Design a protein around this ligand. Structure first.
Ligand SMILES: O=P(O)(O)OP(=O)(O)OP(=O)(O)OC[C@H]1O[C@@H](n2cnc3c(O)ncnc32)[C@H](O)[C@@H]1O
Ligand SMILES: O=P(O)(O)OP(=O)(O)OP(=O)(O)OC[C@H]1O[C@@H](n2cnc3c(O)ncnc32)[C@H](O)[C@@H]1O
Ligand SMILES: [Ca+2]
Ligand SMILES: [Ca+2]
Ligand code: NA
Ligand code: NA
Ligand code: NA
Ligand code: NA
Ligand code: NA
Lengths: 193, 197
């Protein structure tokens, strides 16, 4: 039994069944009454550990967490670890991507490079001194208009060159095969076996 | 021109890190030379403690920083001393006091139950608040001896037998240890990450 230490349904959709396929019994932290951890970390790695640790503390189960975000080159890597609250704590996925959009409206078509980052952590117990920490990243280009209805977050404005479409235009299987998250997950599963 | 602070006060670690970082092309300065005091290690993992030490140095000096958090995990002791390796014998701890304590602790542990592993995490931070530090790790299995042997290295090396070599970590040359240790492995990964960064 392993707790999935996220409240993000888009993350759950991209993780839970692949983890199950692998052979784990996955429980969403909300089912177990785990509230949101304080994300006080300055890096994806530290925040992923904090969220996994918070869930492992509450439940006494091993935990997997995901800290991820979008880094845009012209913005010096923003919104980065502040991706979820980019437009404030009114923030929704649509409000965040539209702010990003508005922010980049005068950025030339050839300067819109970006990269998604993902750190996945597996903690055997809350105080595991050697958690499995796996990361992935995924380069793309920020579009000027959203396209596609799949995925979540900034997916409609993230053009994926290798696919010739945005992340939201991919099927879930396609996106799982190549994303920052799918790359990290492959490394995590390798490490687990 | 541009310096990188080595965020450790452990001379044994400096001896094992500085020369390859210099060969790579980094201008390395030990944090003590810049007057940096030891950070408070409040982390529960090697990775968190390596990040905190790198960040403290980076903040104090305004230079990129590399830190190492490492320790010895003994199976029969449930992984102790672990992240508490440096302070194992307490507030007066020295390498010899720490290894002798561990010795004494393991006195009645049978020969087939003395397995252990060194762990190393190295971190590189461009700035104190770098959201994506380079984080590399290495581990190295061995067996705890009953008596110290060898004078090389530092820390618990005299009591860490390495089955592949048929001698303890302290009986290895500097070159032999760097080729196979938890730290040699992590450092080459870090150099690879730095180049490809
Ligand atoms: O902390 P948890 O509960 O896991 O949920 P969260 O959504 O608050 O998670 P983060 O702090 O890790 O927030 C990261 C964000 O990065 C964005 N993001 C992460 N992965 C994404 C993906 O695959 N596609 C689009 N956006 C993604 C996401 O929409 C948020 O803006
Ligand atoms: O924190 P810094 O300033 O780097 O110095 P420190 O010596 O306090 O560093 P740690 O908290 O990382 O302590 C780790 C320890 O693990 C031991 N250790 C680490 N690497 C070792 C090695 O290669 N051989 C023997 N012992 C080692 C070391 O002697 C300490 O007991
Ligand atoms: Ca969050
Ligand atoms: Ca220390
Ligand atoms: Na979002
Ligand atoms: Na989201
Ligand atoms: Na220690
Ligand atoms: Na030492
Ligand atoms: Na070494």
């Amino acid at each position: 039994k392993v707790v999935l230490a996220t409240g993000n349904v888009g993350k759950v959709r991209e993780l839970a069944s692949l983890l199950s396929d692998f052979g784990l019994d996955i429980v969403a932290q909300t089912d177990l009454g785990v509230d949101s951890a304080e994300e006080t970390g300055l890096t994806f790695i530290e925040n992923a550990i904090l969220k996994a640790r918070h869930a492992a503390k509450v439940t006494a189960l091993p935990a997997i967490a995901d800290a991820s975000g979008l880094a845009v080159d012209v913005l010096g890597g923003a919104p980065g670890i502040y991706s979820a609250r980019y437009s404030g704590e009114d923030a929704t996925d649509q409000k965040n991507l539209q702010k990003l959009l508005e922010t980049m409206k005068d950025v030339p078509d050839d300067q819109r490079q970006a990269r998604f980052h993902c750190v996945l952590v597996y903690l055997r117990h809350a105080e595991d001194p050697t958690p499995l920490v796996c990361h992935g990243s995924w380069p793309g280009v920020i579009t000027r208009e959203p396209a596609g209805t799949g995925g979540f977050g900034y997916d409609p404005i993230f053009f994926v060159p290798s696919e010739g479409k945005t992340a939201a235009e991919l099927t879930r299987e396609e996106k799982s095969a190549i994303s920052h998250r799918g790359q990290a997950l492959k490394l995590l599963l390798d490490a687990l076996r």
